[PDB]
Amino acid sequence: ITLFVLVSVVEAFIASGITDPYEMYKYVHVSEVGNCSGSGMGGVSALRGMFKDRFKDEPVQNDILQESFINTMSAWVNMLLISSSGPIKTPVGACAT
Amino acid sequence: NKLFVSKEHAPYTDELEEDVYLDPLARVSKDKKSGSLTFNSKNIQSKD
Amino acid sequence: AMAATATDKIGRSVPAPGKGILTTAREHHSSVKYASPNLNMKYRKRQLVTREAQIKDWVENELEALKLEAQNEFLLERTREIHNEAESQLRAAQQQWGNDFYKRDPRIAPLRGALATYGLTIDDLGVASFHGTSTKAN
Amino acid sequence: VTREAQIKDWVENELEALKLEAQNEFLLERTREIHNEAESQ
């Protein structure tokens, strides 16, 4: 799911004509770029890891738990592309997210 | 196959990060050498 | 008085805590030789009282104009609106000088402005409840 | 448009009051604030 989000964020910025996100900081402070996107369920594959693959002693990465959080997708977006210190409000609204 | 390009460093160094956070008028600028947007120490808490 | 969130920066550690929340204290000091009157509450209260006089002037014009536009149903419906407009102007004035006087001022950090709204200063913040998790990094 | 006229009236009072409170550093710092107040109104 995080890969779907990363591609979507990059493409959305291309549709805005912003190819380098740091260009945003020529106009605004780093505390003024937010991410309010969310998810109904987050990283369900990581949840399967924790609840089933681990129960069968399959090899599961040690930090699998962090990858299941609904807000981890936005965390990776910031950690790989945006590098802002703006608001981060992740909604969970099932099908109205 | 390079629409997505991962950022390796923040626009500020670890030495300037808190200065950037505490200066609401801090803005990046094109780095002459690297040709990349970065925060410049002379542009932090400046009268300009 | 205040609530805010903040992310950190480029990294590869999801669980690592960072210092983005420090932005809550952001404040431009390049020019601080003389004090800003915006931070003085006596000065803000003077502007509010001036603006409040102008509003009641505005009220009397719109009332008399309605009197000429006139009848009971017409007057009650229009009168409710003009006074509703007047309350909106008063509340906008109060928001300008009492609640949000610092939002446009880069020389006032959000934390400082949140406290100064009620006449407190940075030295009045007595207790910090720490996330205090008992981990080394946090 | 009515309210906009009242604001520029307010601007001229605060400008002249500053002129009497006065110098370069003092004027630039205070002037930035009064015009910032006027934009807010």
Side-chain angles (χ1 to χ4, degrees), chain C residues 102-103 105-120:
Chain C
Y102 61 96
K103 310 303 226 280
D105 199 320
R107 325 213 294 292
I108 305 174
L111 195 155
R112 191 198 298 285
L115 291 163
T117 295
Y118 297 92
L120 297 169

PDB file of all heavy atoms in Angstrom, chain C residues 102-120, unseen atoms left out:
ATOM      1  N   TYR C 102      -1.512  37.853  16.852  1.00  0.00           N
ATOM      2  CA  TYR C 102      -0.137  37.470  16.568  1.00  0.00           C
ATOM      3  C   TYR C 102       0.010  36.514  15.396  1.00  0.00           C
ATOM      4  O   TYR C 102       1.141  36.231  14.996  1.00  0.00           O
ATOM      5  CB  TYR C 102       0.480  36.812  17.807  1.00  0.00           C
ATOM      6  CG  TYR C 102      -0.248  35.560  18.220  1.00  0.00           C
ATOM      7  CD1 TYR C 102       0.189  34.314  17.811  1.00  0.00           C
ATOM      8  CD2 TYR C 102      -1.382  35.628  19.010  1.00  0.00           C
ATOM      9  CE1 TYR C 102      -0.476  33.176  18.183  1.00  0.00           C
ATOM     10  CE2 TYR C 102      -2.053  34.498  19.385  1.00  0.00           C
ATOM     11  CZ  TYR C 102      -1.598  33.275  18.971  1.00  0.00           C
ATOM     12  OH  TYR C 102      -2.272  32.143  19.346  1.00  0.00           O
ATOM     13  N   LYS C 103      -1.090  36.011  14.836  1.00  0.00           N
ATOM     14  CA  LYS C 103      -0.993  34.989  13.800  1.00  0.00           C
ATOM     15  C   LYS C 103      -0.249  35.488  12.569  1.00  0.00           C
ATOM     16  O   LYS C 103       0.382  34.696  11.866  1.00  0.00           O
ATOM     17  CB  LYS C 103      -2.388  34.505  13.402  1.00  0.00           C
ATOM     18  CG  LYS C 103      -3.285  34.125  14.565  1.00  0.00           C
ATOM     19  CD  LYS C 103      -2.656  33.049  15.433  1.00  0.00           C
ATOM     20  CE  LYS C 103      -3.647  31.942  15.785  1.00  0.00           C
ATOM     21  NZ  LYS C 103      -4.555  32.318  16.902  1.00  0.00           N
ATOM     22  N   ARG C 104      -0.316  36.784  12.282  1.00  0.00           N
ATOM     23  CA  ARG C 104       0.380  37.367  11.142  1.00  0.00           C
ATOM     24  C   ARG C 104       1.747  37.929  11.506  1.00  0.00           C
ATOM     25  O   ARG C 104       2.429  38.470  10.631  1.00  0.00           O
ATOM     26  CB  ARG C 104      -0.468  38.486  10.521  1.00  0.00           C
ATOM     27  N   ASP C 105       2.169  37.815  12.763  1.00  0.00           N
ATOM     28  CA  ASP C 105       3.366  38.496  13.225  1.00  0.00           C
ATOM     29  C   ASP C 105       4.508  37.499  13.339  1.00  0.00           C
ATOM     30  O   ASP C 105       4.517  36.696  14.283  1.00  0.00           O
ATOM     31  CB  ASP C 105       3.103  39.165  14.572  1.00  0.00           C
ATOM     32  CG  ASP C 105       4.108  40.248  14.891  1.00  0.00           C
ATOM     33  OD1 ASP C 105       5.306  40.050  14.606  1.00  0.00           O
ATOM     34  OD2 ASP C 105       3.699  41.294  15.434  1.00  0.00           O
ATOM     35  N   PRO C 106       5.491  37.506  12.430  1.00  0.00           N
ATOM     36  CA  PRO C 106       6.581  36.521  12.531  1.00  0.00           C
ATOM     37  C   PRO C 106       7.446  36.692  13.762  1.00  0.00           C
ATOM     38  O   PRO C 106       8.202  35.776  14.090  1.00  0.00           O
ATOM     39  CB  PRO C 106       7.390  36.755  11.247  1.00  0.00           C
ATOM     40  CG  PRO C 106       7.088  38.148  10.864  1.00  0.00           C
ATOM     41  CD  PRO C 106       5.665  38.389  11.266  1.00  0.00           C
ATOM     42  N   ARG C 107       7.375  37.830  14.439  1.00  0.00           N
ATOM     43  CA  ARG C 107       8.150  38.068  15.643  1.00  0.00           C
ATOM     44  C   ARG C 107       7.469  37.547  16.901  1.00  0.00           C
ATOM     45  O   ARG C 107       7.960  37.804  18.000  1.00  0.00           O
ATOM     46  CB  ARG C 107       8.435  39.561  15.801  1.00  0.00           C
ATOM     47  CG  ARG C 107       8.662  40.280  14.493  1.00  0.00           C
ATOM     48  CD  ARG C 107       9.652  41.410  14.637  1.00  0.00           C
ATOM     49  NE  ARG C 107       9.159  42.486  15.488  1.00  0.00           N
ATOM     50  CZ  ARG C 107       8.147  43.288  15.182  1.00  0.00           C
ATOM     51  NH1 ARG C 107       7.462  43.146  14.059  1.00  0.00           N
ATOM     52  NH2 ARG C 107       7.819  44.264  16.021  1.00  0.00           N
ATOM     53  N   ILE C 108       6.360  36.826  16.767  1.00  0.00           N
ATOM     54  CA  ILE C 108       5.666  36.227  17.899  1.00  0.00           C
ATOM     55  C   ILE C 108       5.482  34.749  17.594  1.00  0.00           C
ATOM     56  O   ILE C 108       4.744  34.391  16.672  1.00  0.00           O
ATOM     57  CB  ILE C 108       4.319  36.900  18.179  1.00  0.00           C
ATOM     58  CG1 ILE C 108       4.523  38.402  18.376  1.00  0.00           C
ATOM     59  CG2 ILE C 108       3.650  36.272  19.402  1.00  0.00           C
ATOM     60  CD1 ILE C 108       3.260  39.176  18.508  1.00  0.00           C
ATOM     61  N   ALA C 109       6.133  33.892  18.373  1.00  0.00           N
ATOM     62  CA  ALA C 109       5.959  32.463  18.203  1.00  0.00           C
ATOM     63  C   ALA C 109       4.540  32.053  18.593  1.00  0.00           C
ATOM     64  O   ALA C 109       3.917  32.686  19.443  1.00  0.00           O
ATOM     65  CB  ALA C 109       6.963  31.695  19.054  1.00  0.00           C
ATOM     66  N   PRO C 110       4.004  30.994  17.979  1.00  0.00           N
ATOM     67  CA  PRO C 110       2.671  30.517  18.388  1.00  0.00           C
ATOM     68  C   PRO C 110       2.544  30.232  19.880  1.00  0.00           C
ATOM     69  O   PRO C 110       1.520  30.582  20.472  1.00  0.00           O
ATOM     70  CB  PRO C 110       2.490  29.243  17.560  1.00  0.00           C
ATOM     71  CG  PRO C 110       3.396  29.386  16.413  1.00  0.00           C
ATOM     72  CD  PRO C 110       4.513  30.281  16.797  1.00  0.00           C
ATOM     73  N   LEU C 111       3.560  29.627  20.501  1.00  0.00           N
ATOM     74  CA  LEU C 111       3.531  29.364  21.940  1.00  0.00           C
ATOM     75  C   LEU C 111       3.412  30.664  22.735  1.00  0.00           C
ATOM     76  O   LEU C 111       2.532  30.814  23.600  1.00  0.00           O
ATOM     77  CB  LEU C 111       4.801  28.607  22.328  1.00  0.00           C
ATOM     78  CG  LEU C 111       4.901  27.897  23.677  1.00  0.00           C
ATOM     79  CD1 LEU C 111       5.914  26.768  23.584  1.00  0.00           C
ATOM     80  CD2 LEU C 111       5.267  28.857  24.781  1.00  0.00           C
ATOM     81  N   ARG C 112       4.273  31.634  22.421  1.00  0.00           N
ATOM     82  CA  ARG C 112       4.235  32.914  23.115  1.00  0.00           C
ATOM     83  C   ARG C 112       2.899  33.611  22.921  1.00  0.00           C
ATOM     84  O   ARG C 112       2.353  34.179  23.868  1.00  0.00           O
ATOM     85  CB  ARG C 112       5.368  33.818  22.637  1.00  0.00           C
ATOM     86  CG  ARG C 112       5.539  35.051  23.510  1.00  0.00           C
ATOM     87  CD  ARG C 112       6.320  36.159  22.839  1.00  0.00           C
ATOM     88  NE  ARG C 112       7.685  35.770  22.510  1.00  0.00           N
ATOM     89  CZ  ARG C 112       8.668  35.652  23.392  1.00  0.00           C
ATOM     90  NH1 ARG C 112       8.467  35.845  24.683  1.00  0.00           N
ATOM     91  NH2 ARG C 112       9.886  35.345  22.965  1.00  0.00           N
ATOM     92  N   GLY C 113       2.366  33.597  21.701  1.00  0.00           N
ATOM     93  CA  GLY C 113       1.088  34.246  21.454  1.00  0.00           C
ATOM     94  C   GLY C 113      -0.049  33.572  22.191  1.00  0.00           C
ATOM     95  O   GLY C 113      -0.917  34.240  22.756  1.00  0.00           O
ATOM     96  N   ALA C 114      -0.043  32.239  22.218  1.00  0.00           N
ATOM     97  CA  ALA C 114      -1.051  31.506  22.970  1.00  0.00           C
ATOM     98  C   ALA C 114      -1.081  31.961  24.418  1.00  0.00           C
ATOM     99  O   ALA C 114      -2.156  32.174  24.987  1.00  0.00           O
ATOM    100  CB  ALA C 114      -0.780  30.006  22.894  1.00  0.00           C
ATOM    101  N   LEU C 115       0.093  32.131  25.029  1.00  0.00           N
ATOM    102  CA  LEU C 115       0.111  32.593  26.416  1.00  0.00           C
ATOM    103  C   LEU C 115      -0.263  34.070  26.524  1.00  0.00           C
ATOM    104  O   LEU C 115      -1.051  34.452  27.391  1.00  0.00           O
ATOM    105  CB  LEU C 115       1.478  32.333  27.034  1.00  0.00           C
ATOM    106  CG  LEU C 115       1.801  30.858  27.250  1.00  0.00           C
ATOM    107  CD1 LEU C 115       3.285  30.682  27.457  1.00  0.00           C
ATOM    108  CD2 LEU C 115       1.023  30.284  28.419  1.00  0.00           C
ATOM    109  N   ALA C 116       0.280  34.912  25.647  1.00  0.00           N
ATOM    110  CA  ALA C 116       0.058  36.349  25.727  1.00  0.00           C
ATOM    111  C   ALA C 116      -1.395  36.725  25.497  1.00  0.00           C
ATOM    112  O   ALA C 116      -1.801  37.827  25.870  1.00  0.00           O
ATOM    113  CB  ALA C 116       0.939  37.067  24.710  1.00  0.00           C
ATOM    114  N   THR C 117      -2.182  35.847  24.898  1.00  0.00           N
ATOM    115  CA  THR C 117      -3.596  36.118  24.727  1.00  0.00           C
ATOM    116  C   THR C 117      -4.231  36.429  26.078  1.00  0.00           C
ATOM    117  O   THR C 117      -5.098  37.281  26.168  1.00  0.00           O
ATOM    118  CB  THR C 117      -4.323  34.930  24.061  1.00  0.00           C
ATOM    119  OG1 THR C 117      -3.825  34.752  22.732  1.00  0.00           O
ATOM    120  CG2 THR C 117      -5.826  35.169  24.017  1.00  0.00           C
ATOM    121  N   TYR C 118      -3.783  35.749  27.128  1.00  0.00           N
ATOM    122  CA  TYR C 118      -4.349  35.947  28.451  1.00  0.00           C
ATOM    123  C   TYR C 118      -3.442  36.733  29.373  1.00  0.00           C
ATOM    124  O   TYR C 118      -3.637  36.726  30.581  1.00  0.00           O
ATOM    125  CB  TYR C 118      -4.647  34.577  29.047  1.00  0.00           C
ATOM    126  CG  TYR C 118      -5.673  33.832  28.252  1.00  0.00           C
ATOM    127  CD1 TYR C 118      -5.298  32.968  27.239  1.00  0.00           C
ATOM    128  CD2 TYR C 118      -7.024  34.021  28.489  1.00  0.00           C
ATOM    129  CE1 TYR C 118      -6.241  32.295  26.494  1.00  0.00           C
ATOM    130  CE2 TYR C 118      -7.973  33.351  27.752  1.00  0.00           C
ATOM    131  CZ  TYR C 118      -7.576  32.495  26.756  1.00  0.00           C
ATOM    132  OH  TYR C 118      -8.524  31.837  26.026  1.00  0.00           O
ATOM    133  N   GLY C 119      -2.443  37.404  28.828  1.00  0.00           N
ATOM    134  CA  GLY C 119      -1.554  38.201  29.646  1.00  0.00           C
ATOM    135  C   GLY C 119      -0.422  37.446  30.312  1.00  0.00           C
ATOM    136  O   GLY C 119       0.315  38.034  31.083  1.00  0.00           O
ATOM    137  N   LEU C 120      -0.271  36.163  30.025  1.00  0.00           N
ATOM    138  CA  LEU C 120       0.837  35.395  30.564  1.00  0.00           C
ATOM    139  C   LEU C 120       2.073  35.544  29.686  1.00  0.00           C
ATOM    140  O   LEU C 120       1.998  35.959  28.530  1.00  0.00           O
ATOM    141  CB  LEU C 120       0.459  33.922  30.683  1.00  0.00           C
ATOM    142  CG  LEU C 120      -0.684  33.631  31.648  1.00  0.00           C
ATOM    143  CD1 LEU C 120      -1.144  32.207  31.493  1.00  0.00           C
ATOM    144  CD2 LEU C 120      -0.251  33.914  33.070  1.00  0.00           C
TER     145      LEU C 120
END
